[PDB]
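INPUT
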Amino acid sequence: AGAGSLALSLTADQMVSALLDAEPPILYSEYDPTRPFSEASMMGLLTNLADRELVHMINWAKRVPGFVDLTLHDQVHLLECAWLEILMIGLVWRSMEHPGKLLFAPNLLLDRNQGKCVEGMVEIFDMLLATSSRFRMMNLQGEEFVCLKSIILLNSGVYTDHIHRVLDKITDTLIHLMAKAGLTLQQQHQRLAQLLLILSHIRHMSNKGMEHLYSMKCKNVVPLSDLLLEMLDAHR
Amino acid sequence: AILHRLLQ
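OUTPUT
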């Protein structure tokens, strides 16, 4: 259960405030690459960055309204299902104002050709770039981005009722943000659908990403953290 | 199970 939850009594404005307060820091790469990259040094940077991002993603998840009302069991399942989708929406968000490039970190901005270094990486970079460009075109606002990141967390393991009540509250919040920005009812419903449809592309990139991370594992190119090995195991 | 320990 999650009956009586504070998360359902929140206003849209209070839900946005809670979500903004929860935000993880923007991480730097603890290493600059020597140019050029190998398969091993690229995957090393991304895997290292991802491992550091996961630690903060865990603290974020706990400050997401409704999340901590779940059993520790269900909390584990949702993060296990969502974590790469969450890293990915973050990447495409930070990359919006960097046309043709992926801002992995302020000191790790790559274009698609540096993607070629690793085998099968270029196709996913292109999908990430396209998603980033779609956000840029739609002028995705910070308040909308934190709502979507929360939907991904709550949504990506629900079939993979309280979770439904919290997702409904997050939908009310997005429409609030859109009403407030001066969008007609018609424009609101159309923007909501457009943002949510992008989540199915983010799910897609996450599933391909995971196939790739499991290829890379088998290859033994780069060591993965225990935490990262558990997350992979969760998706077989 | 690391995530269980970090989430608690």
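end of record. The longest helix of chain B spans residues 2-7.
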